[PDB]
Amino acid sequence: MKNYYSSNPTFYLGIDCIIFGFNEGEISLLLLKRNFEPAMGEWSLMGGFVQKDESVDDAAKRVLAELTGLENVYMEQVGAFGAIDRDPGERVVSIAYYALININEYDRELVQKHNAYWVNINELPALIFDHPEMVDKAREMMKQKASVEPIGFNLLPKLFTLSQLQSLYEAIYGEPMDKRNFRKRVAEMDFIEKTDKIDKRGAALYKFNGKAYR
Amino acid sequence: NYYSSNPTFYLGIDCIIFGFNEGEISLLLLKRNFEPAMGEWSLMGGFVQKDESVDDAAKRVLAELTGLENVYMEQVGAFGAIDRDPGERVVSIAYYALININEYDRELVQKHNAYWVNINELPALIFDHPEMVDKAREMMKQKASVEPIGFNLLPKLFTLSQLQSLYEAIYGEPMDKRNFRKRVAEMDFIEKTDKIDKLGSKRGAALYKFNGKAYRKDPKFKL
Ligand SMILES: O[C@@H]1[C@@H](O)[C@@H](O)CO[C@H]1O
Ligand SMILES: O[C@@H]1[C@@H](O)[C@@H](O)CO[C@H]1O
């Protein structure tokens, strides 16, 4: 059995989940009031710790489910945050994970039962520790992702107008966009495709495809 | 004692140092100096210590195992599969860089028994090191697409062929010369100087430089 590596120290390994939600033209962040010390009661990302019996990726899934009830949310790793004094309680290196989801009814009731709250990304309260830095990094990742592949397949209807698409991009990027230049930029995205169908007024309908994955 | 209902983990460090030299990319490798898997081909592997940030751990590990200092690395990810390290549960945070080989002390590296291996002729690496390398390589490609790159990998006055060679090595593919120079035209961070190449491979070729102001990374990503 003994002890490979026992000369080295061990560390608490944190998990923080960053859940962006799109609804009615706005992005919100899912937040809670932290249920343990230090900084108990203060505004927080969904925070937990990696356990011995699980991968770090599965820790994220578990932490999310424990603190919000949400299951079946695919998340992408944001990074390992390991500044010495990031957590005032102990040395904690935290691994952040993020997703962008479409905010829907059953999920809404579930989240509310956990005392998690959707807060508009332009009106965030002061978050504990380095959570604002984590959120900023996830938001930049989301921006970059949206420029190279479909940002999600159930954020918008299967067939969507350019106006609907523009509202999603403006929310992600956090600034209004020029309609003509946005249309030109979309024409350069081979993963968005104009169909023959029209909205029912007369606006052209577009769809995401799988061309960014080839 | 906060958080004591939770366990603690060994936190690995792995450094993935790609080197650019004579139009090709290499990986800096070593023979692992501790067990298990002692003597086998490995990345610069260590562990985070109590004294240091994880970023600073990656610096110390790099300097201990190669002598290289002042090398900026970007985080690849935390690799946390339960069985990735057969010795023990270790969550390893991999870091990467693409450096200019000639710009560093090649004898200092040699002294540390670290070897540049060509990126297309890698030996079998230990544990999940090939996965880490693959991930770093994909990030290098993604950056090269969306950002200005290679200020310290090219001479201050460089040709379009030299710039092309960098991109070709990064993506690992020959490129169309026609379309590349068209893409180079849309890059506002590369400016054409008055000067010309009197020593290199295409004599009299236009020498370009990076415009520092335009090279600078945007604080927020632009569509
Ligand atoms: O980021 C914190 C981490 O440092 C630990 O306190 C667990 O909760 C997370 O939200
Ligand atoms: O990836 C390994 C890590 O798991 C630990 O063994 C330290 O060295 C690294 O190379």
Author numbering:
A (entry chain A): 1 to 200, 205 to 218
B (entry chain B): 3 to 225
From the paper:
We determined the structures of full-length apo–BtAraR protein, its complex with a specific DNA duplex, and its complex with the L-arabinose effector. The solved structures provide a first view of the structural mechanism underlying the regulatory function of the L-arabinose-binding Nudix domain. The comparison of the DNA- and L-arabinose-bound forms shows how L-arabinose binding reduces BtAraR affinity for its specific DNA operator sequence. The movement of several secondary structure elements upon effector binding leads to domain rotation and causes major changes in the dimer conformation. These changes affect the orientation of the wHTH domains, leading to disruption of the protein–DNA interaction. Conservation of the AraR residues involved in the interaction with L-arabinose and with the specific DNA sequences, as well as the conservation of DNA-binding motifs of AraR in other species, together suggest that all orthologs of AraR identified in the Bacteroides and Prevotella species retain their molecular function and specificity toward effector and DNA molecules.
